[PDB]
Each structure stands twice: as C-alpha cells, then as structure tokens.
C-alpha cells in the first residue's frame, strides 16, 4: 500500500562465537540515465587517445548496486575487533533487500522547479544470477555504499566494454540489451529481496609471521650437510683446491633449506623525499608493464611483494601498492600529502622486496680461461617449493572479485586483494521505468522521444554472515594491536568535523596478530 | 568459444576508480624540479588502472612473414628458433605454450614453430612451398594470452636516484605468476584428441 | 627413566641415583612452537642401534633487525605448556597418523621426455626447414618438411621439462677449475629483506650430462660427511657428494641454460637473434621429478603456514 | 492505510484503590535538524569561553521524546488529590504510543509558501533499550510534553558531550552514529508502541 512502510532500518553487528553478522542500511537516489537510451561509446566518442587507451563499448540506462568494500559493512570499531582478535575470516552468507521505493516527477517552468510524487510509476530490478552480463564489479570503482550510514548516495550508471580495434568494433563484439532479462517491477509499496551463499573460499590471513623464511633453523645445532667453502689454497698461481665445511649457526646464509620465497616482478623505487629522486619524468617510461594484443597496461598492483626493506619506509614501488585518496582530495595531479599509500611490509618474511632483484644465477662455466659469472634475476616465476603471502585487505578496499572464465588460472586470489570466486555475489541492476509525455493525436511509427522527468529514492539493506578463525597462540609477550592515540586533537579520527563531513584518516589493514611459519 | 571481452578491458567505462596512480615526477623543465603528483585512474586513462588478473605465461618465438621479401635474407630456421635442452640435446619448442599467433591486422605473420602446420592433400614430405601447407593461427586467444612473437612486458632493472635514471628491461620469457589467466590451444578436425600425461612426481596444467 | 645426581669434591666425582627426581615431557600436538625439525640438524637417533646418544638442546629464532629485536618478535616459554612428569617407574607414549602424502618415486625413467615418439612413423605436422633458396641476394623463401624419425629434434611434443635455476659448475679435478675464489661470489642465491641466502639445494635438477660425472653444481646437491670427518675446510675425499643423474630424462641439467628464446623481430635490416634462458619458472605442460631420498637423509618437513605454495 | 486513523486520543486518570493510572496525549511537530547532518560542536564553535565552560561534543539530526516532568502526567487537581491523601507514591508501569503520523513537504517560491502532503515519506523511531547512548534525560531540560493538553509542542534536538581538553578532543572521546541502530520506519498509516516496567524504587515521602 501507499501508506504502509515496506521495511525497517536494520544496521548493526552481532558477534556470535565464531561468527559475525553485519547489517547495513543506506538511502539511495537513482536518476534517469542516458535519456532512457543505449549508446555506443568509444575513445572516438571520448575524443581520441593513444593506442594503449582505445576502447569500444556501450553505456546503458540502468544503474547498479555495489557493496564490494569492507567499510560498507564494518564500522571502524568492528574492524578493530576483527583484526585485533582473529587470525582469519571469510564471508559465508548474504541477504539483500530493497524497500520504501519513492518515485518523483520534476516539472521545470520558466523560473521554478516543482517536485511531486508519481504514485503509479515503477522501478525495474533484477539480479544477474546466471552471470550472463559483463561483470564490472571487481574493478575498484566508485559508487559503493558510503562508509557513514547517514550519507545518502547516488546509484552509479552501468556500462561495459567489448572487443575493439582502435575505436572500431569487430564481428566478435557483443551487444547486450538489459531489457532482454526478466525483472521485477515495483510501485511504491512493493519491495525486493534475495539471498546468496558464498562459494567455499580460504580464510584471509589476518596475521603477520613472527618468523622469517631464512631463519627457520635451530640456532644451536649444526647441520649434517656440507658446503663448498674454499676453491683456492691462497695467493699465487695453480692454487686450485676444494674445501668443505659444516653449515652451522655461525654461517646461516649457506644452510640447506626446504622452502624458498615466492615469485617476483621488479618495480621501480620512488622516494617520498623528492630530492632523492632523479630529476626526470619516469612515471610511465620507468614503469613495469605487460602487453596484450599490442596494448601496454601498467603492472598494477601486480604480484604481492614487500614494499621496502627494513628502515626504508620512505621508499615505495612505482605501481606496486594501493593508493587511496583522503577526504576532499581532487582527481588530477594532487600532492603526496593528499593521498594514502599502503605498504605490505608484513609479508617481507616470505615475499621478496618489490624493488629488488629476486637473486643471482650462474651465467657461464668457469674453467682454467673464464671466471665465474652471475646475473641478476629481475622476474622469477613460480618454482616448486616456493611459499608466499597474498596482499592484505583494507577497511577501504575491495572484498571479492570474479575469476575470469578461462581454461586455466593459477592461485586466483585477486591481485588488489580479497576473495576470488567463480560465482561471486551477482550484479543487481535497477532502472526507472520510462513514462512517456503526451503523444500526438495522429499515429507516428517512430519511437517516442519525449518523456516525463523522473527519479527515484529508497532504502537498501545488505546483511552478511562471516566466519571467523580464532587465535590460540602460545606467545608469552603481548602482541601488536591497532589502537587510537590518546593525544589531543581538533577532531576525532573516524568521525565528522564541524561541517558534517565524515573522513577516514588512514588505511587500516588486518595483520596485527602474529603466527609462526 | 572465443572471449568477447579483453583482459585489459574489464572495467566500467563510465566510473572512476577510487585508486590513485603516480602521474608526474617533475614540475617542469629545469634543474631541481622533482615532485610527486597523483591522479585518479579513470575512463580517460585505462592503461594505468588497477587490475585483479594478468595474462598467462610466455616463451617468445621468432616472427616469420608469408610475404617472403619481408624476411631477412639469411637461413634462420634452426639458428633463430626457440628451443629447450635436455641431457645436452636440443629440441625445438614446438608448438610450445598456447600464445596468440599475431596482433590485430598482422595475419601474414606466424611464429616460427609456435603453431600446427598441416599438409594439403597430395603434398610431399621434403621442402614443399607455403601454398602446399595449412598454417593454423590461435588469434582467438589474444584476449587472455600474450602474442607469441612479442615480449611479455617490461621490468625495472635498477634504482633511480639523484645519479641514475629509471631503466627497464624486456621480458622474453615469463613463467607462472599468481593471478594469471590463460586459454589453452584449440583443437581441430584434423588434430589430435588426447594424450597420456607422463608418469612423474609433478606436473602443471 | 633413570635420574642421576653428580657430586664433585676436591678430587673425586661421585654419581648416585636420585629416586625421587622427575623428567618433564610433552608433545607440541597443536603446532604452537617454532618447528626446528626439518632443517637437517644433527642429534637424531644414531643409525647403529648400540650407540648411546645425547639429546640435543632446543632453541629457536624470531624476527631480527641486525642483532636487535622488533615489537613483532615472539618469546615462548615452554613451561607454559602442560607436560607429563615422570619418576623412575613411569613411562610415556603417544600415537600419530600421518597425513595423506603421495608415494615417493623409488624408480628411474627408462624413457626420455624428448624420445616418446614411434621411431618408425612420420608425424602429420610440418616444420619450417628452409628460409633462403641459396647463396646470393634476394633469395628469400619458405620451405616446409614433414617431421619424422630422421629429424627428431623438430617434432611437435605435448610436454616439456620442468623448471630451472642455473648453478655454477665445479670439477672434482681441481686443475680444471678457475684459479680464483668463487665459492660465495659465483653462487646462486635469493634475497629476502635485504639478506642473501644460498640457493641450496634448490630446485630438483640433473647434476650433470652424460659422461660428465666429475662435475657437480656448486650448491645444488646434498653433501654428507664421512665418519670421523671434521667440520672446517676438509678435503673432497672426506665428503660424499650425491648426484641426481636419474632425473636427467625429465629435469634440465643443473649447470646448463634451460634453452633459447627469440629476442627481436627479423626483417629485410635485422637478423634473427636469440638469448639464453638461465632461469625458467613453471609453464603449463611441464613435467618433472622431485629430489631423491637417501638412507642418511631427511624424511619429512613441515610446510610453512602461508596463503599460497606450489608443489 | 492513508484514510484510517492509527490511534485514538487517550487522556484521563483512573484512581483504583492503591493505584492511580495517568494517561496523556499530545500533538507534536518535528522539523529536519542540522540539514540531516552530524556536526561536531565545542566552545570553539560556540565562540570560546572560560575553562569552566569548555566542552566538546556532537549534535545529531535526531529528536527525542521526553516526559520526565510530573505535569506531563498529572493535572493540578490530580496532583492535589495525590498530595492531600497519600504518604507515598512511586511509578510501576509505562506504555508509550506514537500514532497518526503526517509528513508534509514545503515549497517556497519567490513570494509564496505551499505545504503539501507527502504520502510516501517515512519517520524513523527507536528506543535505546540497552542504554548504549549518552543519556541526556535527567538534566532538567526544556522540550517535555506541555502541561496543558491542548498545546502543540516541538520535538527537541538530540546532542551529547564527550571528553574534552579545552575545545579539543582526546583519543578516549566517543562518536556515536544513531543510524547504526535498528529503527522502525513509519509511513502515514503505521504506528509505534512499547511497554516498560520500572525498577523497584522506594516510595517518595509525600
């Protein structure tokens, strides 16, 4: 009915043993996109570009619901609870509701704007439960539910890309009509809901290692293996020899080991002290990249690698880490104090440093003549016996990604962080039903071009159940914990200021507790 | 099936990312102009957007044109070929890892030993011309697999400082990395159906 | 269990029984302590059943910055575990079920990976055999031939040898080695947090080619000591160098390049250029054998608790 | 429904032996507070003051219902009955109802103000039954139900204070979002109610 509410405001968190259930409700507004039309888009329509930036695709009159960020579900305090008390977590169940739909019509006279209710208009909503549409979630896009529950947000417009040759299309390109799906139609008084079960995924590692991969031995006992220690008796000619020694606590670098650090793809090193950087432009020319069909793409963020060495936190890889913007930061050429650079220093115990060579390999045969020659390894692929950690997740970062439907993949954990699934939470698509203005009184076969100006508003609720993996550590000394600082300040961190603006002052990871290797 | 989307074109072309990328390192011409400027990655600059998955592995092949006048006037069938060694014996890398045969609009090029070549009916066995054979092309997998006759990409090879400039190097062979996706080689009406996996301790795909 | 007390006077040592003393024993069944087994340490049960052995002391390492510790470092007290206390007269026992693991391969291959074809039948695939008609200018051509028993090197194959990480080659005939010190400088290594570690023994690779058993990789094989061998700078006749020659049929040789890759585009001008592959990571379609086990060698290891691992 | 009343006007008192039951009904108006925003407030935002008057806190877009005054429940004659005839009294039970919700939209042209019904709008209401919010009742504030049942009253705005150092905040200060609570949503046609039992308290000495 018109006078009865279709749902209530549900927003809290329940901590139930080894489960936590988060619930979020937000207020959304949806405009009419594209004047109800499907439009072909390309870099031609955007004004042209280089070959690396060419594309072809379509924008649709539909919008979509995205909640693929952790702050859509966790408050900062709840995130603190989770990361300070658990070794792991993963999503299990999802429930989604859309309710209290209101459709408004806008009339603009010469000098006045009037907004009225349109009680008989509809919104169309459907889920892509069979994964038949291009999946644009999982590209770290704007338009998710806002972190602050009081913020009213605008629903982003749906569009997609297909195969391109420059700004042109090939015969293999696909065009999708979203009206060619069955969808539910809602007047003011109807609601929509659905449930979803997550795939079985591994727990995320919300811990750091308290041991290093090269320091796993007993520091008191020798090995029963020998290593070559000398090849010449001394100075002079014809001094060749072979001497062997026991590998022990005095020489840990030469001990035999069972496991080796994971793969690498070297990045350029950039200092936040700008005077230490080379006085030249190297953002694009000095960057690591990969090529596909003649197009170059930045290797960003790339394989999970440690950001810097010990004591070198002023250095960061060129495109090897996630960079978030601070509240109120612009979009073009902002200074370093306006952005937030994450660092994966916790994985330095298993993962190679991002701005270093993996190691050295022999490159010749020494003989009595050529000396022994070695070469640097700048990119090392997977080898048997390698171990590694994945990239951390953040309160501001993405949760899941869709694994591409391919013949083969390896370790399909998404490179920007999170859970990779073949059947992720489905896309939820929504659109205001077009309402024509007065048609002519003589028949015309052309499609109608005049429409009543409308938009819609409502409430959306998402509830996720997460499974937790508790710590049972035997460590004696206290752990490192995420904490607020007592020292006085003008504002409270993770709160509003005097003007009403909510901000997140820093990125928060998940790795504070410790575990052995 | 073939993919109607490319691995580097999986984003919404209307919405910005909430991630930033380094866009400028010098304020302008002159000495001591060092700076750090960051920009939002969006639809105008798709090459610098953050991505979750990357193309599969590569092992570069030499490029041969079916227009013979474009080829080098020398013998390079064996000397210029990609190969692997086993117990001191060299074997051709043939057909090798599944890679795209050529770029867009370059169907006259083919990898030296990266594709299956069938004979036409009545074709001999020794030194037959190109019109007597049938060269397959795996152009459908260019959306996930790197091109067979190209480098995988570029890697940094030094530390830039205020002095050394930023230096990069070509990757001619890239092994498996986590987050890589790829397609396998297509099958043909004339081609094989199955093979026996060798009885070994380990194998991959 | 027998507990003895020792009293040392000015010039005499007396050993007596202490009937009321205890030993404490426990198993780390939840894997809460640093696992120092699996580092090929001394102190195991002796091979000869008549030898009386001394129990090794337990110690462990944690995160370090030079010789200093960081706030992430863990300190473990072993008294903070429940343990059984035994007087002379008590015993201790427990049982354990192994995880499901693959069988170890106690066999060698009688076939080579590049020799899996029928040596009597041609392939139905062609290969490029000639690119120039002959000597002279403007002789470009394309000629194709059937791959058959006469040219086995160019046949199409379904599977390729496993990964590699090249090692330096050392001869046991010392006069053949370079007259310089290259044990550390010429060695293969990997880096972690600015620290260099020897790649030892590294990926399972064949030690040498056919007929070159005098060569061995610098740090690519297990070296055992003979009975009575010292610990510092002993000669080669005092140690025992293992060789993984049985896996040469699937695994690349440790002291060789994996192969060659193209490094340019030939055209009519640049000639065809190739480059050596010194380290090759995993590729789809690769097969390999693992390292052999020995009567003197280790049995098991603990896989590190990480997000990802391969084989 | 739109055309059906959600409740009746109940306002009287029943004297039943050793019990008295009071019932009060009033008409309320609620505006939009803070332009729907949460704002940080302090003596800095108020213009400064002495040390004894410094504070730090937040104002919210929510209002609240207060009836913590005796004339919200007792008429003067009922009060006379109580105090002239009893040595003691204490509260035992409470029932609360909110009904006949009407939401109006206001449009202001160049020289005219038009008020219309918005039949599809909602009000959100909830009780802090677990006592998780700062309790601002019990500070003798204005904004209660008026003594005279015919007076229409305006709902006061909710705000609270936390730890301050001058006009600054410390790390121990708490920020509360009231949207982080489950609340009932009411269109014109819905009503809200709840019941409460008072703690055992001693009789007041009248």
The DSSP line for B44-86 is T-GGG---S-EE--EE---EEESSGGGS-SS--TTTTS-EEEE
Residue A346 is labelled as binding a ligand: yes
User: Which H helix or E strand runs over C6?
Assistant: strand C4-8
- Residue that has been written with the tokens 């338009």 in this structure: A143
- Say whether B175 and A381 touch across the interface (CB within 8 A): yes
User: Could you give the CA distance from residue A292 to residue A299 in angstroms, rounded to a whole number?
Assistant: 12
Region for residue A383 given its phi and psi (left: phi exceeds 0; alpha: psi -120 to 50; beta: otherwise): beta
Q: Evaluate whether B95 touches B115 at the Cβ level (below 8 Å).
A: yes
> How far is the CA of D34 from the CAs of A204, D40, D160, in angstroms?
41, 11, 14
Q: Evaluate whether A218 touches C36 at the Cβ level (below 8 Å).
A: yes
User: Could you give the CA distance from residue D3 to residue A28 in angstroms, rounded to a whole number?
Assistant: 29
User: Could you give the CA distance from residue B61 to residue B172 in angstroms, rounded to a whole number?
Assistant: 9
C237-242: Cβ within 8 A, 24+ apart: C238/A244, C239/A226, C239/A244, C241/C172, C241/C216, C242/C292, C242/C294
Of B101, B109, B97, B77, the closest CA to residue C272 belongs to B77
Terminal Cα-to-Cα distance of chain B (whole angstroms): 20
- Asked if D184 reaches chain A (Cβ–Cβ under 8 Å), the answer is yes
User: Could you give the CA distance from residue C229 to residue C207 in angstroms, rounded to a whole number?
Assistant: 24
Q: Which two tokens stand for residue A441?
A: 């009184």
Q: Which two tokens stand for residue A166?
A: 């420059």
Of D25, D43, D29, the closest CA to residue D157 belongs to D29
- Say whether B69 and C256 touch across the interface (CB within 8 A): no
Q: Which two tokens stand for residue C297?
A: 């060698």
Q: Which two tokens stand for residue A109?
A: 């006279």
- Say whether C270 and B72 touch across the interface (CB within 8 A): yes
- CA-nearest residue to C130 within chain B is B77
Q: What contacts A431, CB < 8 A, 6 or more positions away? A: A30, A33, A61, A62, A63, A123, A124, A125, A178
3-state secondary structure of A446: coil
- Asked if A235 reaches chain C (Cβ–Cβ under 8 Å), the answer is no
- Asked if A110 reaches chain D (Cβ–Cβ under 8 Å), the answer is no
Number of H helices, E strands in chain C: 0, 21
Q: Which two tokens stand for residue C65?
A: 């910055």
Half-sphere exposure of A185 (CA within 13 A, CB side): 8
Those of residues 24-63 in A touching chain D at CB distance below 8 A are 25
Q: Evaluate whether B92 touches B83 at the Cβ level (below 8 Å).
A: yes
Q: Evaluate whether D82 touches D74 at the Cβ level (below 8 Å).
A: yes
* E-state strands within A210-321: 226-232, 240-246, 260-261, 264-265, 269-271, 289-292, 295-298, 315-317
Q: C223-225 and C239-241: which strand pairing?
A: antiparallel
User: Mutating which of A99, A110, A186, A500 best tests the D interface, going by the most D Cβ atoms within 10 A?
Assistant: A500
Q: Where does C28-170 have alpha helices with state H?
A: none
Number of H helices, E strands in chain D: 2, 17
Q: Evaluate whether D156 touches D143 at the Cβ level (below 8 Å).
A: yes
Of D28, D34, D25, D29, the closest CA to residue D158 belongs to D34
- Asked if B12 reaches chain A (Cβ–Cβ under 8 Å), the answer is yes
Cis status of the peptide bond prior to A475, with omega within 30 of 0:
no
User: Could you give the CA distance from residue A252 to residue C67 in angstroms, rounded to a whole number?
Assistant: 14
3-state secondary structure of B2: coil
Residues of A in contact with D171 (CB under 8 A): 484-487, 489, 493
User: Could you give the CA distance from residue A438 to residue A43 in angstroms, rounded to a whole number?
Assistant: 37
User: Could you give the CA distance from residue A111 to residue D109 in angstroms, rounded to a whole number?
Assistant: 9
**Phi first, then psi: what are they for A179, rounded to 5°?**
-70, -15
Of A90, A144, A70, A13, the closest CA to residue A394 belongs to A70
Q: Resolution for this model in angstroms, one decimal place?
A: 2.3
3-state secondary structure of C22: coil
User: Could you give the CA distance from residue B173 to residue C259 in angstroms, rounded to a whole number?
Assistant: 11
Q: How far is A106 from chain D (nearest CA, A)?
A: 13
Those of residues 210-229 in C touching chain B at CB distance below 8 A are 210
Mind giving me the DSSP string for A54-118?
Answer: --EEEEEEEEEE---BGGGT--HHHHHHHHHHEEEEEEEEEEEEEEEEEEEEEEE-SS-EEEEE-
User: Could you give the CA distance from residue C210 to residue C293 in angstroms, rounded to a whole number?
Assistant: 22
Residues of A in contact with D109 (CB under 8 A): 112
Q: What contacts B14, CB < 8 A, 6 or more positions away? A: A59, A156, A157, A158, A159, B43
- Say whether C74 and A221 touch across the interface (CB within 8 A): no
For residue B19, the 8-state DSSP code is: B
User: Considering Cα of C223, then C226, then C232, then C233, what sign does the dihedral take?
Assistant: negative
| Cα-based angle A217, A221, A223 (whole degrees, multiple of 5) | 75
Residue C246 is labelled as binding a ligand: yes
Terminal Cα-to-Cα distance of chain C (whole angstroms): 42
3-state secondary structure of A127: strand
Q: Evaluate whether A456 touches A104 at the Cβ level (below 8 Å).
A: yes
Strand partners, A463: A23, A95
- CA-nearest residue to D164 within chain A is A488
Length of chain A, in residues? 517
What technique solved it? cryo-EM
Cis status of the peptide bond prior to C201, with omega within 30 of 0:
yes
- Asked if D201 reaches chain A (Cβ–Cβ under 8 Å), the answer is no
Q: How far is C137 from chain A (nearest CA, A)?
A: 33
User: Could you give the CA distance from residue A391 to residue B75 in angstroms, rounded to a whole number?
Assistant: 49
Q: Which chains touch D (3 or more CB pairs under 8 A)?
A: A
User: Mutating which of D171, D176, D188 best tests the A interface, going by the most A Cβ atoms within 10 A?
Assistant: D171
Residue B173 is labelled as binding a ligand: no
- Say whether D121 and A114 touch across the interface (CB within 8 A): no
Cis status of the peptide bond prior to B95, with omega within 30 of 0:
yes
User: Could you give the CA distance from residue A98 to residue A10 in angstroms, rounded to a whole number?
Assistant: 12
Q: Evaluate whether A163 touches B139 at the Cβ level (below 8 Å).
A: no
- Residue that has been written with the tokens 């599944």 in this structure: B98
For residue D43, the 8-state DSSP code is: H
Exposed, middle or buried, A197 (CB in 10 Å: 0-12/13-18/19+)?
Answer: exposed
Cis status of the peptide bond prior to C5, with omega within 30 of 0:
no
Residue B140 is labelled as binding a ligand: yes
- Say whether B204 and C282 touch across the interface (CB within 8 A): yes
Nearest neighbour of B12 by CB, restricted to A141, A262, A291: A141
> How far is the CA of D183 from the CAs of A12, C110, D100, D180, in angstroms?
11, 76, 18, 9
User: Could you give the CA distance from residue A328 to residue A501 in angstroms, rounded to a whole number?
Assistant: 9
Q: Which two tokens stand for residue D136?
A: 């601002």
Q: Which two tokens stand for residue C88?
A: 């002379």
Of A460, A400, A402, the closest CA to residue A132 belongs to A402
Q: Evaluate whether D119 touches D188 at the Cβ level (below 8 Å).
A: yes
- Asked if D99 reaches chain A (Cβ–Cβ under 8 Å), the answer is no
Terminal Cα-to-Cα distance of chain D (whole angstroms): 47
User: Could you give the CA distance from residue C201 to residue A258 in angstroms, rounded to a whole number?
Assistant: 8
Distance of CA D2 to the CA centre of its chain: 25
**Phi first, then psi: what are they for A105, rounded to 5°?**
-110, 145
Q: How far is D116 from chain A (nearest CA, A)?
A: 10
Residues of C in contact with A226 (CB under 8 A): 223-225, 234, 239
Q: Which two tokens stand for residue B129?
A: 């011309």
Those of residues 75-94 in B touching chain A at CB distance below 8 A are none
- Say whether A480 and C71 touch across the interface (CB within 8 A): yes
Q: Which two tokens stand for residue B22?
A: 């380094």
> How far is the CA of C296 from the CAs of A407, A472, B81, C237, D121, in angstroms?
43, 36, 44, 18, 81
Q: Which two tokens stand for residue C280?
A: 């090759």
């Amino acid at each position: 009915g018109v006078g009865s509410s279709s749902g209530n405001w549900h927003c809290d968190s329940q901590w139930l043993g080894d489960r936590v259930i988060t619930t979020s409700t937000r207020t959304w507004a949806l405009p009419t996109y594209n004047n109800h039309l499907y439009k072909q888009i390309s870099n031609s329509t955007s004004g042209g570009s280089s070959n690396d930036n060419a594309y072809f695709g379509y924008s649709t009159p539909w919008g979509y619901f995205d909640f693929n960020r952790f702050h859509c579900h966790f408050s900062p305090r709840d995130w603190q609870r989770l990361i300070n008390n658990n070794w792991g977590f993963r999503p299990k169940r999802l429930n989604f509701k859309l309710f209290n739909i209101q459709v408004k019509e806008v009339t603009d006279n010469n000098g006045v704007k009037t907004i009225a209710n349109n009680l008989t208009s509809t919104v169309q909503v459907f889920t892509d439960s069979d994964y038949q549409l291009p999946y644009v979630l999982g590209s770290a896009h704007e338009g998710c539910l806002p972190p602050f529950p009081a913020d009213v947000f605008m629903i982003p417009q749906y569009g997609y890309l297909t195969l391109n040759d420059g700004s042109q299309a090939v015969g293999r390109s696909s065009f999708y009509c979203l009206e060619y799906f069955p969808s539910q139609m809602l007047r003011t008084g109807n609601n929509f809901q659905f449930s979803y079960e997550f795939e079985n995924v591994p727990f995320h590692s919300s811990y750091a290692h308290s041991q290093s991969l090269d320091r796993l031995m007993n520091p008191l006992i020798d090995q029963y293996l020998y290593y070559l220690s000398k090849t010449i008796n001394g100075s002079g000619q014809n001094q060749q020899t072979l001497k062997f020694s026991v590998a022990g606590p005095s020489n840990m670098a030469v001990q035999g080991r069972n496991y080796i650090p994971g793969p690498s793809y070297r990045q350029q090193r950039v200092s936040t002290t700008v005077t230490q950087n080379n006085n030249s432009e190297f953002a694009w020319p000095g960057a690591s990249s990969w090529a596909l069909n003649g197009r170059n793409s930045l290797m960003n963020p790339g394989p999970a690698m440690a950001s810097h060495k010990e004591g070198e936190d002023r250095f960061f890889p060129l495109s090897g880490s996630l960079i978030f913007g601070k509240q109120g930061t612009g979009r073009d050429n902002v200074d370093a104090d306006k952005v937030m650079i994450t660092n994966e220093e916790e994985i330095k115990t298993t993962n190679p440093v991002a701005t270093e060579s993996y190691g050295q390999v022999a490159t010749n045969h020494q003989s009595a003549k050529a000396q022994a020659q070695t070469g640097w390894v700048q990119n090392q692929g997977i080898l048997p016996g390698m171990v590694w950690q994945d990239r951390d997740v953040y309160l501001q970062g993405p949760i899941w990604a869709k694994i591409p439907h391919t013949d083969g993949n390896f370790h399909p954990s998404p490179l920007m962080g999170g859970f990779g699934m073949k059947h992720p939470p489905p896309q939820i698509l929504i659109k205001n039903t077009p309402v024509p203005a007065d048609p002519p009184t003589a028949f015309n076969k052309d499609k109608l071009n005049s429409f009543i100006t409308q938009y819609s508003t409502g409430q959306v609720s998402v509830e996720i159940e997460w499974e937790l993996q508790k710590e049972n550590s035997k460590r004696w000394n206290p752990e490192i914990q995420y904490t607020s600082n007592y020292y006085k300040s003008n504002n409270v961190e993770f709160a509003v200021n005097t003007e009403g603006v909510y901000s997140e002052p820093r990125p928060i990871g998940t790795r504070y507790l410790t575990r052995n290797l």
